[PDB]
Design a protein around this ligand. Structure first.
Ligand SMILES: NC(=O)c1ccc[n+]([C@@H]2O[C@H](COP(=O)([O-])OP(=O)(O)OC[C@H]3O[C@@H](n4cnc5c(N)ncnc54)[C@H](OP(=O)(O)O)[C@@H]3O)[C@@H](O)[C@H]2O)c1
Ligand SMILES: Nc1nc(=O)c2nc(CNc3ccc(C(=O)N[C@@H](CCC(=O)O)C(=O)O)cc3)cnc2[nH]1
Length: 160
C-alpha cells in the first residue's frame, strides 16, 4: 500500500563499496532502527547476505532469482511478488541494495536517507531521485562528534 526506500548515502550517493559500509556512524544506523521496526523489509540477496540475520520483528523479504537458502526469511522472485509478500501493511521498507533500490524507487512514495559527508569510492550508488519528483519533508544536519567521524544529515523525502 506504500513503499519507502531507506538508505545511507555518502558523496556521489555512494551506498556500497566492496559490498560493505565504510562510514562507521552509529547515529546513522540508529536512524535505520527507528524507521524500519515493525514494518516489513524488502532487500536484494546481496543485502541479505550482509545482514546475516533477519531484521527482528519484521517480515524479511529477499529478492533473488534462485531458490532460497534460509528459512528464516521470505524468498521472492520479482518486485511485485516482493510487495505482495509484505501483506496489507501501511508501509513497506526497501533496504537495498543498489539494484533493488533502483527497481523500487518508481514505486516508492517516501525516502529515508542519511547523507554522510564522507568520500568513499563506490561501485554501487543509490538511484538518482529527481528533485522534481521528491519534496523534502524533514531534514536535520549534525556535525561530526564523538561517535560520528563524519558530518551527517538525516532526510525524509515524499513523492510529489
Ligand atoms: N548504504 C546503503 O544504504 C545500502 C543499502 C544496502 C546495501 N548497500 C550496498 O549496496 C550493495 C548491494 O546492492 P547489490 O545491487 O550489490 O545487490 P542487492 O541489490 O543487495 O541484491 C542483488 C541481488 O538481489 C537479487 N534480485 C534483485 N532484484 C531482483 C529481481 N527483480 N528478481 C530476482 N532477483 C532479484 C539478485 O540475486 P540472484 O543473483 O540470486 O538473482 C541480485 O543479484 C552492496 O555494496 C551493499 O553494501 C548499501
Ligand atoms: N539510514 C540508513 N542507514 C543505514 O546504515 C542503512 N543500511 C541499510 C542496509 N545495510 C544494513 C547494514 C546493517 C544493518 C544492521 O546491522 N542493523 C540492525 C541493528 C540496528 C543497527 O545496527 O543500527 C537492524 O536491526 O537492522 C542494517 C542495514 C539500509 N538502509 C539504511 N538506512
Amino acid at each position: 500500500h506504500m513503499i519507502s526506500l531507506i538508505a545511507a548515502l555518502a558523496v556521489d550517493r555512494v551506498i556500497g563499496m566492496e559490498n560493505a559500509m565504510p562510514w562507521n556512524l552509529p547515529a546513522d544506523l540508529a536512524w535505520f532502527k527507528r524507521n524500519t521496526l515493525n514494518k516489513p523489509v524488502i532487500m536484494g540477496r546481496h543485502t541479505w547476505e550482509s545482514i546475516g540475520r533477519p531484521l527482528p520483528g519484521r517480515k524479511n523479504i529477499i529478492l533473488s532469482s534462485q531458490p532460497g537458502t534460509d528459512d528464516r526469511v521470505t524468498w521472492v522472485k520479482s518486485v511485485d511478488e516482493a510487495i505482495a509478500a509484505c501483506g496489507d501493511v501501511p508501509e513497506i521498507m526497501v533496504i537495498g541494495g543498489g539494484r533493488v533500490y533502483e527497481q523500487f524507487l518508481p514505486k516508492a512514495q517516501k525516502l529515508y536517507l542519511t547523507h554522510i559527508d564522507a568520500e568513499v569510492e563506490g561501485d554501487t550508488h543509490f538511484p538518482d531521485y529527481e528533485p522534481d519528483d521528491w519534496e523534502s519533508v524533514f531534514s536535520e544536519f549534525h556535525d561530526a562528534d564523538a561517535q560520528n567521524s563524519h558530518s551527517y544529515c538525516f532526510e525524509i523525502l515524499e513523492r510529489r
